[PDB]
Amino acid sequence: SHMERVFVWDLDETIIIFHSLLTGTFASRYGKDTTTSVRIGLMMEEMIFNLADTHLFFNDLEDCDQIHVDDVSSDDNGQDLSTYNFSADGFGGVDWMRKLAFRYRRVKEMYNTYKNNVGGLIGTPKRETWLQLRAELEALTDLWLTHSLKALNLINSRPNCVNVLVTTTQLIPALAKVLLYGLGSVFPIENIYSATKTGKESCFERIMQRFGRKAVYVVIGDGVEEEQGAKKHNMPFWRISCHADLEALRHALELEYL
Ligand SMILES: [Mg+2]
């Protein structure tokens, strides 16, 4: 009988601060040193793609511009990839499709086993560089991530609330970000969508398709694409422009019992 909410999030400058570190927009808007901002921004970028290329077959999967990890699960035979050798498996369109599905599934496996042990995934000494980077970033952003997480965790813990992510970032890179920003635990991987290809209103429609019409969808984000797509589908939109907006959201999450 319970009413159910579906929270559709944007990533960059909504849940995390990353791109705006490279443009000087954040440092400028909140009076931070621009030079440190760019330095921090480029280090994360390096870590994001290094993780992507090194563990998430990014050099292989990049040109596939896939939307959801399970999009090619038709061609997955379900065998154990523990001992499977991806490097020397020659990576066509049907025998090739199985090899693609294998990588996306291994990515999914990596994500689930390391979502709460990212330092274990990237290993040392990168782990320490990461923890220090995350600390530098958290300070310069005045605890932005701390704010977004409070809302994400309230949604997670709440029984009739769900967390969905729709980002224009490509899929593999988007997963690397999520992991490096400690969002693996709050976002079930089957809930991440890459709108790089289809566009956001497509993903939104698809998400409604998936959760039904009886659900109340809330589009959360800082950008126009997200907001415009919320209009097409007459989905309430919650804009995030500062820490205050993330607090307003957490507050609302805190008052309702479904
Ligand atoms: Mg954004």
DSSP assignment of the chain equals ----EEEEE--BTTTB-SHHHHHSHHHHHTT--HHHHHHHHHHHHHHHHHHHHHHS-HHHHGGG--SSGGGGGGG------SS--STTS----SSHHHHHHHHHHHHHHHHHHHTT-HHHHH-TTHHHHHHHHHHHHHHHTTTHHHHHHHHHHHHHHSTTEEEEEEESS-HHHHHHHHHHTT-TTTS-GGGEEETTTT-HHHHHHHHHHHH-SSSEEEEEESSHHHHHHHHHTT--EEE--SHHHHHHHHHHHHH---
To the question of whether residue 222 is assigned a binding role by annotation, the answer is: yes
To the question of whether residue 12 is assigned a binding role by annotation, the answer is: yes
- Distance in angstroms (rounded) separating the CA atoms of residues 245 and 253: 12
Give catalytic residue positions: 10, 12
Resolution of the experimentally solved model in angstroms: 2.5
Say if residues 174 and 54 touch (Cβ distance below 8 Å): no
Say if residues 233 and 204 touch (Cβ distance below 8 Å): yes
Lateral strand order in the sheet of 161-167 = 192-194, 161-167, 5-9, 216-221, 237-239
Q: How far is the CA of 19 from the centre of ligand 1 (A)?
A: 9
Output the six-digit token pair for 9: 């999030």
How far is residue 55 from each of residues 90, 114, 125, measured CA to CA in Å? 18, 11, 16
Q: How far is the CA of 84 from the centre of ligand 1 (A)?
A: 37
Q: How far is the CA of 161 from the centre of ligand 1 (A)?
A: 22
Output the six-digit token pair for 222: 């800082």
Those residues with Cβ within 8 angstroms of residue 252's Cβ, 6 or more apart along the chain or in another chain? none
Say if residues 74 and 94 touch (Cβ distance below 8 Å): no
- Distance in angstroms (rounded) separating the CA atoms of residues 100 and 89: 11
Output the six-digit token pair for 22: 């490279």
Q: How far is the CA of 107 from the centre of ligand 1 (A)?
A: 24
To the question of whether residue 71 is assigned a binding role by annotation, the answer is: no
Q: Is the dihedral of CA 237, 241, 243, 244 positive or negative?
A: negative
Cis before 125? omega within 30? yes
Experimental determination approach used: X-ray
Question: Which amino acid is present at 126?
Answer: K
Distance of CA 27 to the CA centre of its chain: 23
Among the listed residues 73, 58, 59, 63, the one whose alpha carbon sits nearest the alpha carbon of residue 175: 58
Q: Report all structural domains of the chain as residue ranges with CATH numbers, in order of start.
A: 1-258 (3.40.50.12350)
Q: How far is the CA of 178 from the centre of ligand 1 (A)?
A: 14
